[PDB]
Enzyme design. Structure first.
Site, mmCIF file in Angstrom:
data_model
loop_
_atom_site.group_PDB
_atom_site.id
_atom_site.type_symbol
_atom_site.label_atom_id
_atom_site.label_comp_id
_atom_site.label_asym_id
_atom_site.label_seq_id
_atom_site.Cartn_x
_atom_site.Cartn_y
_atom_site.Cartn_z
ATOM 1 N N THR A 16 0.807 -1.213 0.000
ATOM 2 C CA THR A 16 0.000 0.000 0.000
ATOM 3 C C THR A 16 0.846 1.271 0.000
ATOM 4 O O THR A 16 0.271 2.367 -0.011
ATOM 5 C CB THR A 16 -0.967 0.017 1.189
ATOM 6 O OG1 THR A 16 -0.251 -0.265 2.397
ATOM 7 C CG2 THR A 16 -2.056 -1.032 1.000
ATOM 8 N N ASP A 39 6.655 -11.515 -28.325
ATOM 9 C CA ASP A 39 7.772 -10.581 -28.246
ATOM 10 C C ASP A 39 8.936 -11.039 -29.127
ATOM 11 O O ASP A 39 8.716 -11.648 -30.184
ATOM 12 C CB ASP A 39 8.171 -10.434 -26.769
ATOM 13 C CG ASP A 39 8.731 -9.065 -26.439
ATOM 14 O OD1 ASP A 39 9.857 -8.767 -26.874
ATOM 15 O OD2 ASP A 39 8.062 -8.286 -25.721
ATOM 16 N N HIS A 69 14.744 -8.119 -25.126
ATOM 17 C CA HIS A 69 13.489 -7.505 -24.696
ATOM 18 C C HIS A 69 12.473 -8.548 -24.231
ATOM 19 O O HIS A 69 11.888 -8.417 -23.147
ATOM 20 C CB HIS A 69 12.964 -6.654 -25.854
ATOM 21 C CG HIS A 69 11.718 -5.882 -25.557
ATOM 22 N ND1 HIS A 69 10.461 -6.396 -25.784
ATOM 23 C CD2 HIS A 69 11.531 -4.613 -25.123
ATOM 24 C CE1 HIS A 69 9.552 -5.492 -25.465
ATOM 25 N NE2 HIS A 69 10.174 -4.398 -25.067
ATOM 26 N N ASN A 161 5.133 4.373 -25.288
ATOM 27 C CA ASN A 161 6.135 5.239 -24.671
ATOM 28 C C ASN A 161 6.232 6.607 -25.339
ATOM 29 O O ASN A 161 7.310 7.197 -25.419
ATOM 30 C CB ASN A 161 7.507 4.573 -24.655
ATOM 31 C CG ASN A 161 7.484 3.197 -24.017
ATOM 32 O OD1 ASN A 161 6.664 2.911 -23.143
ATOM 33 N ND2 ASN A 161 8.390 2.329 -24.459
ATOM 34 N N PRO A 175 -10.384 -1.425 -26.905
ATOM 35 C CA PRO A 175 -11.050 -1.276 -25.601
ATOM 36 C C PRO A 175 -11.105 -2.550 -24.781
ATOM 37 O O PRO A 175 -11.051 -2.470 -23.548
ATOM 38 C CB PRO A 175 -12.462 -0.802 -25.979
ATOM 39 C CG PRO A 175 -12.287 -0.132 -27.297
ATOM 40 C CD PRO A 175 -11.237 -0.945 -28.010
ATOM 41 N N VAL A 177 -9.119 -5.175 -24.292
ATOM 42 C CA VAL A 177 -7.940 -5.743 -23.644
ATOM 43 C C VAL A 177 -7.526 -4.846 -22.482
ATOM 44 O O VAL A 177 -8.152 -3.810 -22.231
ATOM 45 C CB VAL A 177 -6.799 -5.961 -24.654
ATOM 46 C CG1 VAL A 177 -7.263 -6.897 -25.783
ATOM 47 C CG2 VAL A 177 -6.289 -4.630 -25.215
ATOM 48 N N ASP A 200 -6.301 1.116 -18.622
ATOM 49 C CA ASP A 200 -7.028 0.416 -17.573
ATOM 50 C C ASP A 200 -6.315 0.423 -16.232
ATOM 51 O O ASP A 200 -6.974 0.329 -15.191
ATOM 52 C CB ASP A 200 -7.262 -1.041 -17.975
ATOM 53 C CG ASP A 200 -8.139 -1.171 -19.199
ATOM 54 O OD1 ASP A 200 -9.369 -0.991 -19.060
ATOM 55 O OD2 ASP A 200 -7.628 -1.467 -20.300
ATOM 56 N N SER A 224 6.550 -1.457 -21.766
ATOM 57 C CA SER A 224 6.861 -2.868 -21.976
ATOM 58 C C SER A 224 7.205 -3.586 -20.679
ATOM 59 O O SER A 224 7.081 -4.815 -20.613
ATOM 60 C CB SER A 224 8.061 -3.016 -22.911
ATOM 61 O OG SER A 224 7.718 -2.858 -24.273
ATOM 62 N N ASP A 260 -3.039 7.157 -5.899
ATOM 63 C CA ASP A 260 -1.722 7.294 -5.296
ATOM 64 C C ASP A 260 -0.648 7.761 -6.269
ATOM 65 O O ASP A 260 0.465 8.083 -5.830
ATOM 66 C CB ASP A 260 -1.295 5.973 -4.649
ATOM 67 C CG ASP A 260 -2.154 5.615 -3.456
ATOM 68 O OD1 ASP A 260 -2.518 4.431 -3.304
ATOM 69 O OD2 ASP A 260 -2.498 6.533 -2.679
#
Length: 279
Positions: A16, A39, A69, A161, A175, A177, A200, A224, A260
């Site tokens: 938290t 990937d 990656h 990014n 929308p 996913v 999301d 990523s 937060d």
């Protein structure tokens, strides 16, 4: 269970508060789930994967990760030290070449591959796909991600990014996913993270230590890196029976740390992935 001196992002997803260094999680650890990492590949021989990673598909002359990656992202999903879901099975799908690039037609084929290939795997606790990739808006790329999700796979995708609205990028803009932005160790939006109504959830994405090729480790930054935190979290929560592939994104948002993060633009969710694990 408690992992001391864990990477900050693992500690963050079980806390938290920012500023701690121990990761706390239920020992089930994603056992019986599967995560596809779509990937550059995965260095399955890395000791950090403990034999739980394998390559299942490539569109190139090798299935090896000649970039790093994909190995890094897979490590954040499920490596013993750097991973969220330390007992999940990892399946590599190499849609990106060793320079990190891939044609949209190959990426789409890889998504449809996963939707079918899961029927050839043993994943009694459920199936996740982690897509730390993207480019400009494409209805066909979005539709492929939507199909994969519809088929019963929890799809997590990088927001991108560009420090811009993710509406202009794919598959981030699909929308249905789970579109994942990035935060830093001080609970600030990562300086490069895309934002917007389509996001999301946020996950740790700045200075993330994970596995690298050559049996090594390294710290890199990006949406990523945030995406596999969320994918691993989904696998972990599905193994616990707390959610399902169809609803894992919304469950993660429902149970997130709320309000937060700093520098979240008006109209973007202020939600940070959190496992709510109580020892």
């Amino acid at each position: 269970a408690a992992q001391t001196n864990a990477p900050w992002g693992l500690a963050r997803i079980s806390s938290t508060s920012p500023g701690t260094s121990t990761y706390y999680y239920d020992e089930s650890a994603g056992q019986g789930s599967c995560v596809y990492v779509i990937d550059t590949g995965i260095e399955a021989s890395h000791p950090e994967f403990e034999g739980r990673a394998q390559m299942v598909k490539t569109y190139y002359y090798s299935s090896r990760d000649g970039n790093g990656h994909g190995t890094h992202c897979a490590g954040t999903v499920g490596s013993r030290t750097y991973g969220v879901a330390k007992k999940t099975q990892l399946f590599g799908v190499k849609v990106l070449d060793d320079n990190g690039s891939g044609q949209y037609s190959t990426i789409i084929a890889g998504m449809d591959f996963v939707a079918s290939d899961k029927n050839n795997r043993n994943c009694p606790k459920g199936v996740v796909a982690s897509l730390s990739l993207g480019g400009g808006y494409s209805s066909s790329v979005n539709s492929a991600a939507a199909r994969l999700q519809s088929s019963g796979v929890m799809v997590a995708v990088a927001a991108g990014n560009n420090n811009a609205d993710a509406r202009n990028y794919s598959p981030a803009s699909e929308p249905s996913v789970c579109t994942v932005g990035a935060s830093d160790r001080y609970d600030r939006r990562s300086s490069f993270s895309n934002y917007g109504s389509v996001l999301d959830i946020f996950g740790p994405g700045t200075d993330i230590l994970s596995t690298w090729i050559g049996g090594s480790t390294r710290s890199i930054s990006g949406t990523s890196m945030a995406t596999p935190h969320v994918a691993g979290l989904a696998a972990y929560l599905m193994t616990l029976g707390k959610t399902t592939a169809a609803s894992a994104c919304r469950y993660i948002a429902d149970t997130a740390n709320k309000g937060d993060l700093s520098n979240i633009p008006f109209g973007t969710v202020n939600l940070l992935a959190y496992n709510n694990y109580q020892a």
